[PDB]
Each structure stands twice: as structure tokens, then as C-alpha cells.
Amino acid sequence: XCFXKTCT
Amino acid sequence: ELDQLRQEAEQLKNQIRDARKACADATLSQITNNIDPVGRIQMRTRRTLRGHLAKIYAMHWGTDSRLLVSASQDGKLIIWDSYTTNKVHAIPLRSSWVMTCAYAPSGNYVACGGLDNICSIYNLKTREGNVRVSRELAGHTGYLSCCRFLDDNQIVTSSGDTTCALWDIETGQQTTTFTGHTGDVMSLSLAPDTRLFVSGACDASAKLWDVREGMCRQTFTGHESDINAICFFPNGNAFATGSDDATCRLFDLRADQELMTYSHDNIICGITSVSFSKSGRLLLAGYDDFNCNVWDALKADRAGVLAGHDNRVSCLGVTDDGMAVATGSWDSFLKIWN
Amino acid sequence: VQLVESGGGLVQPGGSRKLSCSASGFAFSSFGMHWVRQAPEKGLEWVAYISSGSGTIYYADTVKGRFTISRDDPKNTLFLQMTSLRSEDTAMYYCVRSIYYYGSSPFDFWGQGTTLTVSSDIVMTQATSSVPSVSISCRSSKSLLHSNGNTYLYWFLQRPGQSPQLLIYRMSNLASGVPERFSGSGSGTAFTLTISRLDVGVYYCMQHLEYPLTFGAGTKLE
Amino acid sequence: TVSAEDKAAAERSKMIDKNLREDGEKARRTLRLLLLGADNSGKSTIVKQMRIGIFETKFQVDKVNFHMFDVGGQRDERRKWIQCFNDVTAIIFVVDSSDYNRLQEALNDFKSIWNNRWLRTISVILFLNKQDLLAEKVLAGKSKIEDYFPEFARYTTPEDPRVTRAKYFIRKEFVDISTASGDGRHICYPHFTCAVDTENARRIFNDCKDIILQMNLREYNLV
Amino acid sequence: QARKLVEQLKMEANIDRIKVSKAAADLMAYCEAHAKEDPLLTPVPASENPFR
Amino acid sequence: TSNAVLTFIYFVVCIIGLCGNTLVIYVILRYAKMKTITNIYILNLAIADELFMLGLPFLAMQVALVHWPFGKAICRVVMTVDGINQFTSIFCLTVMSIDRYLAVVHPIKSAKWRRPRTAKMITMAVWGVSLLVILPIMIYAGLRSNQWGRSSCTINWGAWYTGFIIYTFILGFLVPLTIICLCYLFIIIKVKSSKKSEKKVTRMVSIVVAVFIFCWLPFYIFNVSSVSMPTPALKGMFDFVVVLTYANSCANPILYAFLSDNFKKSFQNV
């Protein structure tokens, strides 16, 4: 899905 | 008995008033209206001296116009250099309440005093590189307000018990005492030749005194409230006085009459200190409105204003050479203006 | 005011020794101290200087790395340690005091010395080796004048069997206890001392503009 | 550019500057108080009880150091030298309630002090002495209050009812002056004490704590 | 104390007075004579100024 | 379409934050003279907030162009500075509240501990602690491809990521919120123990805590939901969440400085 401060 | 004396006094007062009215010829403003105005004058700060932790109550310039002293309520007395802004001497004090300081014309002793009722004299030119108390003078019932030097071995002292005294350092006893004031006195001014001196008090009066004879030559009264500062004309023929009623006044000796008033309807706070310059065109006066003003000595018009402090001004001074002036306030800072 | 030095002794070359001095009668933390040595058959030469509060230490160029100077304020003592003794390091030692601020008169006092036996810069110029109203001239390689308005030169008198004193600083100011007959004058690279109503001894020129301090050659009045 | 002489002068100046900054902390710790009042009042008695030319007293409570100053003279014309005391924490004002003839002077003095121009931030602690003598004079019955203050007869109360009614009348009379134009900048503390009390220091400590708390909380703008 | 007061007033009464116009002229003349030596109202070049 | 709105939001919030923080820093540095203790903490927080907003345009471009063209050496320091600032702001807020507590609760005895030297010394401690805490964020920063065919850079490379999220959640909420709330509760108790000031102080504490919670909670909620369990709606929601993350920096200086009385008078001087 998404991680940290951005999405894949 | 008493009624006859009162009638005689009233007759004398009426005769004096009639003579004063007869001696008046014309207004000074009309005579001096011909002189061209100096114009707008602007000045800017050059140096700011710092290092105190409380308010300031005194200041006095040196004779060479390079050194000065400063006194505060933290219990310290500091000697400062002008150009380089270095410190030379710092002196602790026995009492923490101080209202005046004095610098000698020779350059060897300093004088301090305040609420303790003793005037202390300190000697700077000693061996082992230390400053020690030279002498202590006691014998006043009230607190001290002002004190100047006549020479290396004389001093004049003014206190709050409506008296003044002349002291000799070596003997230590009042050689002469001046009395005749109804209310407590505040300031004290000294003539260039050290033959006469003038004083003012809280009863809205000024008195002239002779050092040799110790008698009141003349008395003046034209104010309504306390008198806070006094200055002396360079020539030696006039006074400028400031009072709590926000108006400044000019007085003369030979004519025994007032000449001019310095006032404006847009200022209400009191006046705390006054001074002249070398030529005599300018009159510098500080107020309680956080700023100082300069007035024309002849045309009586506003010329310039000085601002930069955050509290009331307490003292100001002008050098003998006339190069620069100095001001201090309750901000714990000193500012040198050019 | 007392400066008493008592220490050291004759030791073999390659050894070491310690020198100490004590002061009494004046404040010690206020002043700055100088160590200066004189050969038996020569003039004076500055050795070392320590400031108030031990802020800065200055050693001579020709003896750097072989001497150490320090002091203790509660004990009111000034000492030095000597290393790598040699034959040429035999000279009498003096300690002097000074204070620096506006209007001060440094190099005020000189103490007694102890004899030790061992088993670019500005160059001064004197008038002559010796000269039997008297005027004495002095010259320098570079003018001793600064932009701030001060010029630096001191006049030192040496008396037989007595320590040197101070007479004139800045060739316009009389030291304490000096009779009014002495006077000095001069300008850029030309200095003059004048005495009237004649006191014999040796008079020294001194330069203080830069850190490496050079004394005068030595002129004697007979 | 700069000679060695100027370097030595600057070094001396820096070493002079260090000591003033170091020394200021030792003096910035203690607390200061002013003492004011009239004659025929127990200033000396309370001063001696707390302890066990200007005159000063120092004492220690709970590792907190207090200084007390007082000035005597000038024939009750103090308009000049009050301006010096513009930074003290508190002024202690003490009065005798036993005498019924001199109370108007006390009210006049309190009104004069409370409305000074320079003293617009300093707060006052009010002390009332001679409580037992007041009770004895009331119990005697030969002393009348309605003569001096006619309103006392018509007043209604909100060991003896008479002494308490008189005490509260006096307290209201003194306090009512302060609340006219207080503006919330400074407040008043009324207390009752006798000549043999011993717990004054705790009251002073608590009132100083409250004064400092209010000043600080106003500084941080939580109101 | 009335006798001392009236004696002092009589002593101070004996005085010599001067015309207002003459005194004003004297101050004006003195202020005009030395007007060249005042550094406050005539700005000076940076060379002479020590504080600049 | 939504990307344009997101970019507009980024630009607007960046402009507002920069303007406010610049005004505060200039006013504080010019006329205030930093006489009181509070100005030190206010200055520190304002500088941290100002430096936080520097990296906003980079992320705006990254979300707009759906690709990262700057390179590899840029976003490493980008996330480094973001990690520094994101933590120094919170730590400064916590320490300022801690200082606020002692002054009111213990008036007399706190005077010895509160001196300008200690306040000056404590400023660097938070920066150092933040750097030490975020040390591992920049040691494993790399790149990763995307579905659309572009490479974007991300953070340190099964349950290790969940442990990292738990660690950040603990260090971001467990300590700060409770230590902020307990101090204000004790302040209320003390002031009430000794009739309109209570309303004002309660309103202040309530609004502060509400703003903090509303700004910070949804980000961690969404991250936890993602880690526990592929449509454009999820991407849009995440973008709006990371936009909302930045409102605290914009809103803080107004709420702590402008509403304060002993800040307007000097502001009236210039």
C-alpha cells in the first residue's frame, strides 16, 4: 500500500 | 508690634515691585526677533556604554573630556574611558543607596554620598594599585543631594534639612554654614571663578550666596512647584531653571528680573535636568516623556529631539571642549551623543 | 614593598636548577612580572614575561624550549625552572613588576638579584661608549611613533652597587621622586636626554613597541 | 594596528567584567521589604520578636532570606525619598486600633500611600496591634464609638458580640478604601495580631508566595 | 526675629539696577562673538572629529 | 485533477507558514532583545518551524510529477533534515511546557534552577538527542520502482517495519501527550485551590490539546491500518493526510505568540 511519506 | 513689622514688610515688597516694574523697558523676544534662526539640527548616537545592573543617579565629566564616573544602586562606582570604552577602576560601597557623585578638577580624588548621611572621599593615586577610602564627613541631620569641589582641600555640601555647609578635608569641621531655606533643597550650581554660588529648593525659590561672607545677596521666586535642576550661564550673568510644572525659566542677576519662559502646550511631564553648550545658543533639557529636547536660547523655538531610552532620563552632561554630550537613564545604559 | 629572591646555585653543565622570588607589601594578582638577566661583562637583555592571571606567557627567542616560568598567588611566589644548563648561561637575574592601563607607569620597581655561575627586531644605537649641562643622544632603526599619538621609550639609570631605577617614560613625564632638572625630548628616530645643574652612572635606551625587547648599548658619565 | 599596551588594557577590562557578572548572582537571591507606620505603635516590639541613619534587619525562614528596611525622619514629608523604593516586593504598614481619636490620621495616611503615582505596583500588608487592649477598653464600657463614627450605631453585623462587631467594623473601614480604584494591579491583606504573637513569619511567607505567584502568572498570560 | 528680617531686607534693598535692553544686548553680543567656536551647530569634517 | 488541488494546498500552507514564521523571527530578533526566558524557547521553536517547511516543495514536485528526477543524493539529506525537524519541534514543545509547570507550581524554589545559562545550554540538547534518535533513518535510504514506471525513494528496508512503526508511535505520542496534559491538570488544581481566570485557562488547555490530537492522530492511524492489512482513493487519502500533518507548524506561532499580551507592544514599536 503506502509507507513513510509516500506510496508505492 | 507685629502689625507694624508686617506693614513695613509689605511697604518694602511694594517698593521692590514698583522698582522692578519701572526698570522694565521692552520684551526680549522683540529685540531678538531680528537674529536669523539656526534651523533644524539633527544628531545621532556614536557610542553606548554598558555594564550596570540597576538604575543610574549621577554622572560627571572629566577635565580633559576623556574620562567619566558613574554611580548606581547596585553598590558600585565605575570609572570609564570615552574613546576606547575600557574600564579602569571599579569600587564597592559600604551603603547601597547613592544619589550623587563628584569628580575632582586635579584628577586625584572622587566623592560620593547618599541616604547614609556621610560624604565619603576616595583617593585613587596610591601605591599597591588599590583604591582606599581617604576620609568620611559626618554631621548632617538629613540625606545629601549634591556636592562639588572648590579645590583639592575644600568641598560644598547640600542636604535635605534646608541647610548647606562648607567643609575642609584636613580639619574635618564645617567652617561655614548657610541657612535660610523654608523647604528642602535639591540642586546646587557654582560660578566659574568660585566666588559665588546659587541654590534652589522645593519652595519654588532660588537664592544667591557668597562664599567669603556667607550671606544671601539675592532671592528669586516665580515658580509654582518644586525646582529639580539648575544651570549657570557661561558668562556668569544668568540662570536657567527647571521645575515640576513642565516650564523652564531664564533669570538675570543685574536686572533682578525674569526674561523668558520655555514651554509648550503639548507637554505635561516634569523636567529633570538642564544644561547649556559652549557658545550659548542651545539649551538641552531632559523630560519624563522618555526623550530629551533642545531649545533655542534666544528665539524660544523647538529645534530638535533626542530619543532612544525606555525609561526617564536622570542626568546629562556636556564637555568643556564642547565636542559631545552624554546622557543616562534608568535603562542601565549610557549613551554618548555627538 | 619588598621583592626578595634567594635560590639557585652553581651546578655542572647539562644540569638543572630552580629560581624563586617572593613579594610582600602589595597586591600580587594585579601586576605583571618580568624576568631579565645581565651578563657580568655585557648589558641587559630581557628573558621572560608573565601577565596577570596567567593569561599569556612570553619567552625569549634565543632561549625558547629550555626554560619555564610560573607563579602561585595564594603563596605570593614567582618561580622558574631551567633546563640544559650551558657555560654561556651565567648571568645575574632580576625580577620587575608592571601595571598597564590609561596613565600607568610600568617597570616601576626593581628587585635584588642573585649571581649564577656555570661551571627582524629593532636595533638601538647609542651616542658613544662613554662621555666624561649634559645631553645624551639615542637613535633607532625605525621610528617609534604610532597613530594613536603615543611614542614609546624609557630612560633607565644604573648606579654602582644599586639596582636600576626609572626616570622618564614617553620622554615627557617625570617619575615619582625625580628632581625637576632632568628632561627629555625628541622625535622620529632621534631621542635626547638633558640634565642641568649637575648622579654619574650608565643610562639605557629601551624599546617597548614590539614584544622582543631590546635594551641600550650603555653610555657612562664619569 | 594596536600596540601591546592596548592588548593589556583590554585584558584588564575583561577580567574586570567577569567579577561583576559573577557577583550579581549572590545578591539576586534575597528578598526585600519596607516598613512604614506612625509612632506609638509596636514596630520595635515586632522587630525584636521576629529577630529572636537608616536601620536594617535580616532574618532567615525555611532557607529563605529576608531583609527589612525602615527610614525615620523628615517630619512625615517623604514625597522625595519614596521614589527610591520602586522595586521592593512589599510594604508592611502597622497601626494601633486601641486609640479611637487618631484613627482618622491612619485612614488619611493609608489613602495617601495607596494613591501615590510611583507606587502603582507595590503591595501592602496591613497589621493591627493591641487587640487585647481593645477588648479590655470595650469591656470597660466607658468608651463610645458612635460619637466618633455615627454610622457605627446603624451598622448591622454580617467571647462577646460587641468586640467582634467592632473588629469587623474597623476591618471594613480600612479595606473599603483600597477597593475603590484598585484596578486589579495590587491588593491588600488584613490581619489581626497581638503583642505576644509568634507566628507572623509564616503569614509573611505565605503572602509573599501569593504575590510572586500572581505576578508570575500574569507574566505568562494565563488570564 | 522681625528685627533681623527687616534688617536683612533693608540690606538687600540697597542695590544697583541695569536696563533690560542693555543686558539683552550684552548677551546677544557675547553669543555672537564666540559663535565660530561652537562645534554643535556647525558640523565638523571627519578628520577633526575624534569619535567618528 | 486532484493532484492540482493537492499541489495548491502544499503551496498555500508553505506560503502561510513561511510568512508567519518569518514575521515572528524578525520581530523577536529586532526589538524584543531577548530579555526574558520565554523568548529563548519561542525563538528556538520558531526557527525549527521555519526550517521544517523547507522540504515541502520537493515533496510537492514528487507527488505532482509522479516521479523523482532530482537524483539519489538529494532525497537522502531531504529525509535527514525532515527527520531532524519533525522531532525537534515536539521535543521543544514538551520542554517548554515542563518549564511552564515549575514557575507556577513552585514560585520560590524554582528561581535557583532557572537561569539564562541553563536555558542557553539546553537548546542544543534537543537537537543532539533528535539526531541520535534518527541516526538509522539515513543509513538505509534507497530507491524503489512504481507501477506507473517511475522510481521514488523510501526508507530503511517482514515485521521489522511494524516494529519501526511501533517505535515511532511510542516515541511520538506515549511520552509527549501525557506529560503535556498532567502539567496543565496540576496547574488547574493549584490555581483553583487558591472567577473568570478558570474559564480562560481551561479554554486554553482544551484548545491546545484538541489541536494537537486532531493534527497528529490520523497519520498514525492510517499507517497502522496500512501495515496491519490498490486504488487511487487510498493514494489521495494518504496525500491529504500528509498534507494535514503540516498544519501544526503553521498554527503554533500564532497561538503561542500573537495572542500573548507582552508581544503586541513591541510589535507596535515597528
Map out the domains of chain C with their CATH numbers.
2-115 (2.60.40.10), 124-221 (2.60.40.10)
Report d(CA C201, CA E4) in Å as an integer: 74
In 3-state terms, chain B is what percent helix, strand and coil (to 5)? 10, 50, 45
**Residue C15: partners with Cβ closer than 8 Å, 6 or more residues away:** C85
Element (H, E) at C70: strand C67-72
Q: Entry resolution in angstroms? A: 3.3
Report d(CA C114, CA B334) in Å as an integer: 52
- Which ranges constitute the DSSP H helices of C42-106? none
**Residue E30: partners with Cβ closer than 8 Å, 6 or more residues away:** B235, B280
Report d(CA B55, CA B332) in Å as an integer: 5
Contact state of D222 with F201 under an 8 Å Cβ cutoff: yes
CB pairs under 8 A between B and D: 38
Indicate if the alpha-carbon torsion angle F145, F148, F150, F156 is positive or negative. negative
Nearest Cα residue in chain E from B40: E41
Question: Which residues 200-239 on chain F approach chain D with CB closer than 8 angstroms?
Answer: 200-201, 204
The strand pairing partners of C166, in sequence order, are C156
The strand pairing partners of B315, in sequence order, are B328
**Residue in C216, B281, B55, D142 with CA at minimum distance from that of residue E34:** B281
Angle at E14 between CA E8 and CA E19, to 5 degrees: 135
The dihedral region occupied by B139, where left means phi > 0, alpha psi between -120 and 50, and beta the remainder, is left
Question: Which residues 27-46 on chain B approach chain E with CB closer than 8 angstroms?
Answer: 28, 31-32, 35, 38, 41, 46
**Residue F96: partners with Cβ closer than 8 Å, 6 or more residues away:** F41, F45
- The Cα of E3 is separated from the nearest Cα of chain B by a number of Å equal to 8
How far CA D9 is from CA of B169, C32, C103, D170, in Å, comes to 33, 12, 11, 66
Q: Where are the domains of chain B?
A: 1-337
Extract long-range pairs of F205-214: CB within 8 Å, 24+ residues apart: F207/F255, F208/F255, F209/F177, F209/F180, F209/F181, F209/F184, F211/F248, F211/F251, F211/F255, F212/F177, F212/F180, F212/F248, F213/F177
Query: What 3-state class would DSSP assign to C78?
Result: strand
From chain D, which residues contact B within 8 Å (Cβ)?
6, 9-10, 12-13, 16-17, 19-20, 24, 27, 53-54, 71, 73-74, 77, 80-81, 84
Contact state of D13 with B86 under an 8 Å Cβ cutoff: yes
- Which ranges constitute the DSSP H helices of D126-199? 131-140, 151-154, 161-178
Q: How many whole angstroms from its chain centre is CA F202?
A: 23
- The Cα of A8 is separated from the nearest Cα of chain F by a number of Å equal to 5
Question: Cell 508511535 maps to which residue?
Answer: F169
- Hey, is the C-beta of F193 within 8 angstroms of any chain D C-beta? no
Contact state of B81 with C31 under an 8 Å Cβ cutoff: no
Nearest Cα residue in chain B from E16: B254
**Terminal-residue alpha carbon distance, chain B:** 62
Nearest Cα residue in chain F from A5: F242
Contact state of D223 with F201 under an 8 Å Cβ cutoff: yes
Contact state of B115 with D17 under an 8 Å Cβ cutoff: no
Can you count the helices (H) and strands (E) in chain B? 2, 28
Q: Quick check: do F and C touch, 3+ CB pairs under 8 A?
A: no
CATH class of D4-220: alpha beta
Query: Using a CB-CB distance cutoff of 8 angstroms, which residues of chain B are in contact with residue C99?
Result: 129
**Residue B9: partners with Cβ closer than 8 Å, 6 or more residues away:** E5, E6, E9
**Residue F253: partners with Cβ closer than 8 Å, 6 or more residues away:** F20, F21, F24, F45, F46, F49
The strand pairing partners of C192, in sequence order, are C137, C185
Query: Using a CB-CB distance cutoff of 8 angstroms, which residues of chain C are in contact with residue D9?
Result: 100-102
Q: Quick check: do F and A touch, 3+ CB pairs under 8 A?
A: yes
Cell of D5: 599596551
Solved with: cryo-EM
Query: Using a CB-CB distance cutoff of 8 angstroms, which residues of chain B are in contact with residue D71?
Result: 115
**Residue F178: partners with Cβ closer than 8 Å, 6 or more residues away:** none
C215: which DSSP letter? B
**Residue in F231, C185, F79, E11 with CA at minimum distance from that of residue B210:** E11
Report d(CA F64, CA F54) in Å as an integer: 17
Can you count the helices (H) and strands (E) in chain E? 2, 0
* Topology at the third CATH level for domain B1-337: Methylamine Dehydrogenase; Chain H (2.130.10)
Decide if C145 contacts C36 (C-beta within 8 A).
no
Burial class for D206, CB neighbours closer than 10 Å (0-12, 13-18, 19+): exposed
Report d(CA B170, CA B153) in Å as an integer: 7
Element (H, E) at C92: strand C92-98
Question: Which residues 80-119 on chain F approach chain D with CB closer than 8 angstroms?
Answer: 100, 103-104, 107-108, 111-112, 115
Report d(CA D99, CA C102) in Å as an integer: 66
- The Cα of D81 is separated from the nearest Cα of chain B by a number of Å equal to 9
**Terminal-residue alpha carbon distance, chain F:** 44
**Count of domains forming chain F:** 1
How far CA C111 is from CA of C90, C97, C155, in Å, comes to 19, 9, 18
* Angle in degrees, 0-180, between the axes of helices F2-27 and F56-64, rounded to the nearest 10: 170
**Residue B198: partners with Cβ closer than 8 Å, 6 or more residues away:** B188, B189, B191, B206, B207, B208, B209, B230, B232, B239
Strands B271-276 and B258-262: unpaired
Cell of C37: 638577566
The strand pairing partners of B327, in sequence order, are B316, B335
Range of the domain at F102: 1-270
Count CB neighbours of F137 within 10 A: 19
Report d(CA F152, CA A8) in Å as an integer: 8
Indicate if the alpha-carbon torsion angle D202, D204, D206, D208 is positive or negative. negative
Top residue of C98, C101, C108, C148 to mutate, by most chain B CBs within 10 Å, is: C101
Burial class for F238, CB neighbours closer than 10 Å (0-12, 13-18, 19+): buried
